[PDB]
Protein backbone atom coordinates (compact mmCIF):
# COMPACT_ATOMS: atom_id res chain seq x y z
CA UNK A 1 0.00 0.00 0.00
CA UNK A 2 1.28 3.48 -0.88
CA UNK A 3 1.30 6.07 1.93
CA UNK A 4 -0.47 9.42 1.33
CA UNK A 5 -1.06 12.41 3.63
CA UNK A 6 -4.33 14.38 4.01
CA UNK A 7 -4.72 17.66 5.91
CA UNK A 8 -8.06 19.38 6.62
CA UNK A 9 -8.22 23.19 6.82
CA UNK A 10 -10.98 25.74 7.49
CA UNK A 11 -12.41 28.08 10.12
CA UNK A 12 -12.79 27.08 13.78
CA UNK A 13 -16.53 26.25 13.56
CA UNK A 14 -16.41 24.41 10.19
CA UNK A 15 -16.78 20.84 11.59
CA UNK A 16 -13.35 19.53 10.45
CA UNK A 17 -12.61 17.72 13.77
CA UNK A 18 -16.05 16.03 13.81
CA UNK A 19 -15.60 14.92 10.19
CA UNK A 20 -12.19 13.20 10.92
CA UNK A 21 -13.63 11.56 14.10
CA UNK A 22 -16.70 10.09 12.37
CA UNK A 23 -14.67 8.80 9.39
CA UNK A 24 -11.94 7.25 11.57
CA UNK A 25 -14.06 5.72 14.38
CA UNK A 26 -15.19 2.05 14.07
CA UNK A 27 -18.51 2.86 15.76
CA UNK A 28 -20.30 6.25 15.64
CA UNK A 29 -19.80 8.27 18.91
CA UNK A 30 -23.04 7.68 20.79
CA UNK A 31 -21.65 8.46 24.29
CA UNK A 32 -18.94 11.15 23.93
CA UNK A 33 -17.78 13.24 21.00
CA UNK A 34 -14.04 14.01 21.39
CA UNK A 35 -12.88 17.62 21.66
CA UNK A 36 -9.69 16.92 19.68
CA UNK A 37 -8.29 14.58 16.99
CA UNK A 38 -4.60 13.39 17.30
CA UNK A 39 -3.98 11.58 13.95
CA UNK A 40 -5.04 8.37 12.17
CA UNK A 41 -3.84 6.17 9.31
CA UNK A 42 -6.87 4.84 7.38
CA UNK A 43 -6.67 1.70 5.20
CA UNK A 44 -8.58 2.68 2.05
CA UNK A 45 -9.12 0.71 -1.18
CA UNK A 46 -10.30 2.97 -3.99
CA UNK A 47 -10.78 1.87 -7.62
CA UNK A 48 -8.69 -1.28 -6.98
CA UNK A 49 -5.77 0.61 -5.36
CA UNK A 50 -4.77 0.15 -1.70
CA UNK A 51 -3.60 3.27 0.17
CA UNK A 52 -2.53 4.09 3.77
CA UNK A 53 -4.07 7.59 4.19
CA UNK A 54 -2.65 9.56 7.14
CA UNK A 55 -5.23 12.10 8.46
CA UNK A 56 -4.38 15.42 10.16
CA UNK A 57 -6.45 18.31 11.62
CA UNK A 58 -5.44 22.02 11.87
CA UNK A 59 -8.03 22.73 14.68
CA UNK A 60 -6.40 24.92 17.36
CA UNK A 61 -3.88 26.38 14.86
CA UNK A 62 -6.19 29.01 13.23
CA UNK A 63 -4.77 31.97 15.30
CA UNK A 64 -1.06 30.89 15.06
CA UNK A 65 0.38 31.81 11.65
CA UNK A 66 3.87 30.38 12.27
CA UNK A 67 2.79 27.11 13.99
CA UNK A 68 -0.02 26.31 11.48
CA UNK A 69 2.17 25.86 8.32
CA UNK A 70 4.17 23.12 10.12
CA UNK A 71 1.13 20.87 9.41
CA UNK A 72 1.63 21.23 5.58
CA UNK A 73 4.98 19.42 4.65
CA UNK A 74 4.48 16.64 2.08
CA UNK A 75 0.69 16.92 2.03
CA UNK A 76 -0.83 14.90 -0.91
CA UNK A 77 -4.46 16.16 -0.66
CA UNK A 78 -6.16 19.10 1.08
CA UNK A 79 -9.77 19.04 2.30
CA UNK A 80 -10.82 22.71 2.57
CA UNK A 81 -13.89 22.91 4.77
CA UNK A 82 -16.72 25.38 5.44
CA UNK A 83 -19.99 24.83 7.28
CA UNK A 84 -23.22 25.08 5.26
CA UNK A 85 -24.87 26.78 8.34
CA UNK A 86 -22.15 29.51 8.17
CA UNK A 87 -22.12 31.65 4.99
CA UNK A 88 -19.24 33.63 6.69
CA UNK A 89 -17.06 30.45 6.76
CA UNK A 90 -17.49 30.28 2.90
CA UNK A 91 -16.42 33.96 2.47
CA UNK A 92 -13.00 33.29 4.20
CA UNK A 93 -12.18 30.50 1.68
CA UNK A 94 -10.83 32.69 -1.21
CA UNK A 95 -9.35 35.51 0.93
CA UNK A 96 -7.42 33.53 3.57
CA UNK A 97 -7.29 29.73 3.18
CA UNK A 98 -6.83 29.46 -0.58
CA UNK A 99 -3.69 31.72 -0.94
CA UNK A 100 -2.21 30.05 2.18
CA UNK A 101 -2.65 26.46 0.90
CA UNK A 102 -1.51 27.38 -2.63
CA UNK A 103 1.70 28.89 -1.15
CA UNK A 104 2.68 26.01 1.21
CA UNK A 105 1.19 23.13 -0.91
CA UNK A 106 1.86 24.03 -4.56
CA UNK A 107 0.17 21.74 -7.05
CA UNK A 108 -1.62 19.80 -4.28
CA UNK A 109 -5.28 19.04 -5.12
CA UNK A 110 -7.87 20.84 -2.97
CA UNK A 111 -11.34 19.40 -2.46
CA UNK A 112 -13.79 22.07 -1.23
CA UNK A 113 -16.12 20.39 1.30
CA UNK A 114 -19.43 21.79 2.53
CA UNK A 115 -19.92 20.30 6.04
CA UNK A 116 -23.13 20.00 8.17
CA UNK A 117 -25.35 19.65 5.07
CA UNK A 118 -28.16 18.39 7.41
CA UNK A 119 -28.58 22.00 8.69
CA UNK A 120 -29.71 23.29 5.26
CA UNK A 121 -33.27 22.16 6.18
CA UNK A 122 -33.06 22.85 9.94
CA UNK A 123 -35.67 25.37 11.12
CA UNK A 124 -33.60 26.63 14.08
CA UNK A 125 -30.63 27.25 11.70
CA UNK A 126 -32.83 29.07 9.15
CA UNK A 127 -34.38 31.25 11.90
CA UNK A 128 -30.97 32.28 13.36
CA UNK A 129 -29.47 33.08 9.92
CA UNK A 130 -32.57 35.12 8.84
CA UNK A 131 -31.88 37.57 11.75
CA UNK A 132 -28.54 38.51 10.01
CA UNK A 133 -30.13 38.74 6.48
CA UNK A 134 -28.58 35.33 5.69
CA UNK A 135 -29.55 31.76 4.66
CA UNK A 136 -27.76 28.33 4.61
CA UNK A 137 -25.17 28.01 1.81
CA UNK A 138 -26.84 26.84 -1.43
CA UNK A 139 -25.31 23.96 -3.50
CA UNK A 140 -24.57 26.36 -6.42
CA UNK A 141 -22.76 28.77 -4.08
CA UNK A 142 -20.48 25.92 -2.96
CA UNK A 143 -19.83 24.72 -6.56
CA UNK A 144 -19.18 28.30 -7.75
CA UNK A 145 -16.64 28.94 -4.96
CA UNK A 146 -14.87 25.62 -5.73
CA UNK A 147 -14.76 26.51 -9.46
CA UNK A 148 -13.42 30.04 -8.64
CA UNK A 149 -10.58 28.81 -6.35
CA UNK A 150 -9.38 26.12 -8.82
CA UNK A 151 -10.47 23.22 -6.57
CA UNK A 152 -10.11 19.62 -7.84
CA UNK A 153 -13.82 19.29 -6.96
CA UNK A 154 -16.77 20.16 -4.70
CA UNK A 155 -18.43 17.75 -2.22
CA UNK A 156 -20.93 17.92 0.67
CA UNK A 157 -21.35 15.76 3.78
CA UNK A 158 -22.94 15.48 7.21
CA UNK A 159 -20.80 14.13 10.09
CA UNK A 160 -24.05 13.88 12.18
CA UNK A 161 -25.82 11.40 9.83
CA UNK A 162 -22.56 10.07 8.17
CA UNK A 163 -24.06 10.87 4.68
CA UNK A 164 -21.34 11.63 2.13
CA UNK A 165 -18.47 11.04 4.57
CA UNK A 166 -17.08 7.85 3.03
CA UNK A 167 -17.33 9.40 -0.50
CA UNK A 168 -15.28 12.45 0.59
CA UNK A 169 -12.35 10.32 1.86
CA UNK A 170 -12.49 7.89 -1.12
CA UNK A 171 -12.36 10.89 -3.54
CA UNK A 172 -9.51 12.48 -1.48
CA UNK A 173 -7.55 9.20 -1.91
CA UNK A 174 -8.14 9.28 -5.69
CA UNK A 175 -6.94 12.96 -5.77
CA UNK A 176 -3.81 12.08 -3.71
CA UNK A 177 -2.98 9.27 -6.21
CA UNK A 178 -3.17 11.53 -9.35
CA UNK B 179 2.98 3.61 28.67
CA UNK B 180 2.48 1.34 31.69
CA UNK B 181 -0.35 -1.18 31.90
CA UNK B 182 -1.99 0.39 34.99
CA UNK B 183 -2.42 3.79 33.27
CA UNK B 184 -3.42 2.26 29.90
CA UNK B 185 -6.26 0.30 31.54
CA UNK B 186 -7.39 3.35 33.57
CA UNK B 187 -7.63 5.31 30.27
CA UNK B 188 -8.77 2.48 27.91
CA UNK B 189 -12.45 3.58 27.89
CA UNK B 190 -13.76 6.09 25.30
CA UNK B 191 -15.01 8.37 28.10
CA UNK B 192 -15.10 8.98 31.88
CA UNK B 193 -18.77 7.79 31.81
CA UNK B 194 -17.62 4.39 30.44
CA UNK B 195 -14.41 4.24 32.65
CA UNK B 196 -16.27 4.40 36.03
CA UNK B 197 -18.71 1.76 37.41
CA UNK B 198 -22.31 2.39 36.20
CA UNK B 199 -23.55 2.46 39.82
CA UNK B 200 -21.05 5.30 40.53
CA UNK B 201 -21.99 7.19 37.29
CA UNK B 202 -25.70 7.08 38.33
CA UNK B 203 -24.92 9.03 41.50
CA UNK B 204 -23.88 12.20 39.58
CA UNK B 205 -25.63 15.02 37.77
CA UNK B 206 -25.35 15.27 33.96
CA UNK B 207 -23.26 18.49 34.26
CA UNK B 208 -20.65 16.68 36.42
CA UNK B 209 -20.47 13.81 33.93
CA UNK B 210 -19.92 16.31 31.02
CA UNK B 211 -17.14 18.11 32.95
CA UNK B 212 -15.45 14.76 33.92
CA UNK B 213 -15.59 13.39 30.32
CA UNK B 214 -13.52 16.42 29.10
CA UNK B 215 -11.03 16.21 32.02
CA UNK B 216 -10.62 12.47 31.22
CA UNK B 217 -9.92 13.36 27.53
CA UNK B 218 -7.23 15.90 28.60
CA UNK B 219 -5.47 13.25 30.78
CA UNK B 220 -5.92 10.42 28.22
CA UNK B 221 -4.41 12.60 25.37
CA UNK B 222 -1.57 13.69 27.75
CA UNK B 223 -0.77 9.97 28.46
CA UNK B 224 -0.68 9.35 24.65
CA UNK B 225 1.51 12.45 24.09
CA UNK B 226 4.03 11.26 26.75
CA UNK B 227 3.96 7.82 25.01
CA UNK B 228 4.76 9.54 21.59
CA UNK B 229 7.78 11.22 23.30
CA UNK B 230 8.91 7.81 24.73
CA UNK B 231 8.72 6.26 21.20
CA UNK B 232 10.98 9.11 20.00
CA UNK B 233 13.52 8.83 22.87
CA UNK B 234 13.63 5.07 23.56
CA UNK B 235 12.62 3.40 20.30
CA UNK B 236 14.00 5.73 17.61
CA UNK B 237 16.74 7.93 19.17
CA UNK B 238 18.38 5.33 21.45
CA UNK B 239 17.85 2.56 18.85
CA UNK B 240 19.76 4.61 16.26
CA UNK B 241 22.63 5.30 18.72
CA UNK B 242 22.88 1.60 19.65
CA UNK B 243 22.42 -0.04 16.17
CA UNK B 244 23.59 2.55 13.57
CA UNK B 245 26.88 4.34 12.66
CA UNK B 246 25.36 7.80 12.03
CA UNK B 247 27.63 10.87 11.82
CA UNK B 248 27.78 12.89 15.10
CA UNK B 249 25.06 15.55 15.40
CA UNK B 250 22.66 13.64 13.11
CA UNK B 251 20.51 11.92 15.81
CA UNK B 252 20.15 15.30 17.64
CA UNK B 253 19.02 16.89 14.33
CA UNK B 254 16.34 14.19 13.81
CA UNK B 255 15.00 14.47 17.43
CA UNK B 256 15.61 18.04 18.72
CA UNK B 257 14.76 18.72 22.45
CA UNK B 258 13.15 15.27 22.94
CA UNK B 259 14.69 14.78 26.43
CA UNK B 260 13.52 18.25 27.64
CA UNK B 261 10.02 17.72 26.14
CA UNK B 262 9.87 14.29 27.82
CA UNK B 263 10.78 15.87 31.21
CA UNK B 264 8.16 18.64 30.91
CA UNK B 265 5.25 16.34 29.92
CA UNK B 266 6.14 13.33 32.15
CA UNK B 267 6.12 15.70 35.17
CA UNK B 268 2.80 17.29 34.06
CA UNK B 269 1.29 13.80 33.44
CA UNK B 270 2.53 12.71 36.93
CA UNK B 271 0.60 15.60 38.55
CA UNK B 272 -2.61 14.90 36.54
CA UNK B 273 -2.51 11.16 37.44
CA UNK B 274 -1.79 11.95 41.15
CA UNK B 275 -4.83 14.33 41.22
CA UNK B 276 -7.00 11.47 39.82
CA UNK B 277 -5.44 8.93 42.24
CA UNK B 278 -6.11 11.09 45.37
CA UNK B 279 -9.75 11.53 44.16
CA UNK B 280 -10.44 7.72 44.02
CA UNK B 281 -13.12 6.34 46.34
CA UNK B 282 -11.75 3.88 48.93
CA UNK B 283 -12.09 0.32 47.62
CA UNK B 284 -12.01 1.51 43.98
CA UNK B 285 -9.28 1.87 41.35
CA UNK B 286 -11.66 3.57 38.80
CA UNK B 287 -14.32 5.71 40.54
CA UNK B 288 -13.26 9.37 41.02
CA UNK B 289 -14.36 12.95 40.36
CA UNK B 290 -11.72 15.73 39.84
CA UNK B 291 -13.26 18.99 41.16
CA UNK B 292 -10.04 21.19 41.25
CA UNK B 293 -8.12 20.99 37.95
CA UNK B 294 -7.76 24.78 37.43
CA UNK B 295 -5.05 25.22 40.08
CA UNK B 296 -2.88 22.45 38.55
CA UNK B 297 -3.27 24.09 35.08
CA UNK B 298 -2.30 27.56 36.43
CA UNK B 299 0.82 26.03 38.04
CA UNK B 300 1.83 24.21 34.81
CA UNK B 301 1.29 27.29 32.57
CA UNK B 302 2.93 29.93 34.89
CA UNK B 303 6.41 30.56 36.40
CA UNK B 304 9.53 28.56 35.52
CA UNK B 305 7.63 25.58 34.05
CA UNK B 306 5.87 27.94 31.54
CA UNK B 307 9.25 29.61 30.65
CA UNK B 308 10.75 26.14 30.06
CA UNK B 309 7.76 25.13 27.84
CA UNK B 310 8.08 28.41 25.86
CA UNK B 311 11.84 28.02 25.35
CA UNK B 312 11.63 24.30 24.48
CA UNK B 313 8.70 24.59 21.97
CA UNK B 314 10.27 27.70 20.33
CA UNK B 315 13.44 25.62 19.69
CA UNK B 316 11.54 22.38 18.71
CA UNK B 317 9.13 24.06 16.26
CA UNK B 318 12.00 26.10 14.68
CA UNK B 319 13.88 22.81 14.05
CA UNK B 320 10.81 20.83 12.81
CA UNK B 321 11.37 21.33 9.02
CA UNK B 322 15.10 20.52 9.33
CA UNK B 323 14.33 17.27 11.22
CA UNK B 324 11.87 16.13 8.46
CA UNK B 325 14.37 16.88 5.65
CA UNK B 326 17.21 15.11 7.50
CA UNK B 327 14.92 12.06 7.94
CA UNK B 328 13.99 11.99 4.22
CA UNK B 329 17.65 12.22 3.17
CA UNK B 330 18.79 9.35 5.45
CA UNK B 331 15.86 7.07 4.48
CA UNK B 332 16.56 7.51 0.74
CA UNK B 333 20.37 7.14 0.81
CA UNK B 334 21.18 4.81 3.78
CA UNK B 335 20.25 1.08 3.52
CA UNK B 336 21.00 0.25 7.19
CA UNK B 337 18.85 3.30 8.25
CA UNK B 338 15.94 2.19 5.98
CA UNK B 339 16.11 -1.40 7.36
CA UNK B 340 16.13 0.01 10.94
CA UNK B 341 13.04 2.22 10.30
CA UNK B 342 11.14 -0.55 8.49
CA UNK B 343 11.98 -2.96 11.36
CA UNK B 344 11.05 -0.77 14.38
CA UNK B 345 7.89 0.66 12.71
CA UNK B 346 6.58 -2.75 11.46
CA UNK B 347 4.31 -3.56 14.53
CA UNK B 348 0.64 -2.59 14.10
CA UNK B 349 0.77 -0.52 17.37
CA UNK B 350 3.27 1.85 15.59
CA UNK B 351 0.98 2.49 12.55
CA UNK B 352 0.40 6.20 13.44
CA UNK B 353 3.89 6.74 14.92
CA UNK B 354 6.54 6.91 12.22
CA UNK B 355 9.36 9.50 12.74
CA UNK B 356 7.67 12.33 10.77
CA UNK B 357 4.25 11.53 12.37
CA UNK B 358 5.81 11.79 15.91
CA UNK B 359 7.33 15.21 15.08
CA UNK B 360 3.97 16.65 13.89
CA UNK B 361 2.09 15.04 16.84
CA UNK B 362 4.44 16.91 19.23
CA UNK B 363 4.19 20.23 17.33
CA UNK B 364 0.35 19.97 17.35
CA UNK B 365 0.08 19.05 21.07
CA UNK B 366 0.41 22.62 22.44
CA UNK B 367 -2.48 23.99 20.32
CA UNK B 368 -4.87 21.24 21.62
CA UNK B 369 -4.71 22.68 25.21
CA UNK B 370 -7.00 25.78 24.71
CA UNK B 371 -9.65 23.61 22.98
CA UNK B 372 -9.71 21.11 25.91
CA UNK B 373 -9.54 23.81 28.64
CA UNK B 374 -12.32 25.89 27.02
CA UNK B 375 -14.61 22.83 26.95
CA UNK B 376 -13.77 21.92 30.60
CA UNK B 377 -14.52 25.57 31.58
CA UNK B 378 -17.92 25.42 29.77
CA UNK B 379 -18.97 22.69 32.33
CA UNK B 380 -17.24 24.17 35.44
CA UNK B 381 -19.61 27.02 36.38
CA UNK B 382 -20.96 25.23 39.53
CA UNK B 383 -18.04 26.42 41.72
CA UNK B 384 -17.09 30.05 41.07
CA UNK B 385 -13.45 29.53 42.35
CA UNK B 386 -13.11 26.74 39.69
CA UNK B 387 -14.61 28.80 36.82
CA UNK B 388 -12.16 31.62 37.75
CA UNK B 389 -9.13 29.28 37.94
CA UNK B 390 -9.86 27.69 34.53
CA UNK B 391 -10.42 31.16 33.01
CA UNK B 392 -6.95 32.23 34.36
CA UNK B 393 -5.39 28.94 33.01
CA UNK B 394 -6.94 29.45 29.53
CA UNK B 395 -5.42 32.95 29.45
CA UNK B 396 -1.95 31.67 30.44
CA UNK B 397 -2.04 28.88 27.79
CA UNK B 398 -2.97 31.40 25.06
CA UNK B 399 -0.11 33.74 26.23
CA UNK B 400 2.36 30.79 26.02
CA UNK B 401 1.12 29.89 22.49
CA UNK B 402 1.34 33.51 21.30
CA UNK B 403 4.97 33.69 22.59
CA UNK B 404 5.99 30.35 20.98
CA UNK B 405 4.36 31.39 17.64
CA UNK B 406 6.31 34.71 17.74
CA UNK B 407 9.62 32.95 18.50
CA UNK B 408 9.58 30.53 15.55
CA UNK B 409 11.82 30.86 12.45
CA UNK B 410 12.52 27.63 10.48
CA UNK B 411 16.14 26.62 10.41
CA UNK B 412 17.40 25.30 7.08
CA UNK B 413 20.53 23.15 6.79
CA UNK B 414 23.05 25.02 4.64
CA UNK B 415 21.24 28.39 4.79
CA UNK B 416 23.55 31.39 4.27
CA UNK B 417 23.77 34.52 6.46
CA UNK B 418 22.59 36.70 3.52
CA UNK B 419 19.36 34.64 3.15
CA UNK B 420 18.79 34.95 6.93
CA UNK B 421 19.26 38.74 7.37
CA UNK B 422 17.21 39.42 4.17
Ligand SMILES: Cc1nnc(N2CCCCC2)s1
Nearest residue numbers: 030031032193194198201209
Ligand atom coordinates in the same frame (compact mmCIF):
# COMPACT_ATOMS: atom_id res chain seq x y z
C1 LIG C 1 -25.46 10.51 26.71
C2 LIG C 1 -24.77 9.57 27.70
N1 LIG C 1 -23.82 9.87 28.56
N2 LIG C 1 -23.36 8.85 29.34
C3 LIG C 1 -23.91 7.67 29.16
N3 LIG C 1 -23.60 6.44 29.88
C4 LIG C 1 -24.75 5.60 30.46
C5 LIG C 1 -25.26 4.51 29.51
C6 LIG C 1 -24.18 3.72 28.91
C7 LIG C 1 -23.07 4.49 28.35
C8 LIG C 1 -22.50 5.51 29.34
S1 LIG C 1 -25.09 7.88 27.91
Ligand SMILES: Cc1nnc(N2CCCCC2)s1
Nearest residue numbers: 065066068069099100101103
Ligand atom coordinates in the same frame (compact mmCIF):
# COMPACT_ATOMS: atom_id res chain seq x y z
C1 LIG D 1 0.29 31.81 7.47
C2 LIG D 1 0.75 32.32 6.11
N1 LIG D 1 1.98 32.68 5.81
N2 LIG D 1 2.17 33.13 4.53
C3 LIG D 1 1.13 33.12 3.74
N3 LIG D 1 1.11 33.53 2.35
C4 LIG D 1 -0.21 33.81 1.64
C5 LIG D 1 -0.06 33.78 0.11
C6 LIG D 1 1.06 34.60 -0.36
C7 LIG D 1 2.34 34.40 0.31
C8 LIG D 1 2.22 34.46 1.84
S1 LIG D 1 -0.20 32.54 4.68
Ligand SMILES: Cc1nnc(N2CCCCC2)s1
Nearest residue numbers: 018021022029033159160161
Ligand atom coordinates in the same frame (compact mmCIF):
# COMPACT_ATOMS: atom_id res chain seq x y z
C1 LIG E 1 -19.87 13.10 15.83
C2 LIG E 1 -21.08 14.01 15.67
N1 LIG E 1 -21.19 15.05 14.87
N2 LIG E 1 -22.38 15.72 14.93
C3 LIG E 1 -23.29 15.25 15.76
N3 LIG E 1 -24.61 15.80 16.01
C4 LIG E 1 -25.36 15.36 17.28
C5 LIG E 1 -24.89 16.16 18.51
C6 LIG E 1 -24.94 17.60 18.30
C7 LIG E 1 -24.37 18.11 17.05
C8 LIG E 1 -24.81 17.31 15.82
S1 LIG E 1 -22.57 13.88 16.52
Ligand SMILES: Cc1nnc(N2CCCCC2)s1
Nearest residue numbers: 033034035371372374375378
Ligand atom coordinates in the same frame (compact mmCIF):
# COMPACT_ATOMS: atom_id res chain seq x y z
C1 LIG F 1 -17.55 17.87 20.39
C2 LIG F 1 -17.38 19.23 21.03
N1 LIG F 1 -18.26 19.90 21.76
N2 LIG F 1 -17.83 21.11 22.24
C3 LIG F 1 -16.61 21.46 21.91
N3 LIG F 1 -15.91 22.67 22.27
C4 LIG F 1 -14.50 22.96 21.73
C5 LIG F 1 -13.72 23.93 22.62
C6 LIG F 1 -14.53 25.09 22.97
C7 LIG F 1 -15.76 24.78 23.69
C8 LIG F 1 -16.66 23.90 22.80
S1 LIG F 1 -15.96 20.19 20.94
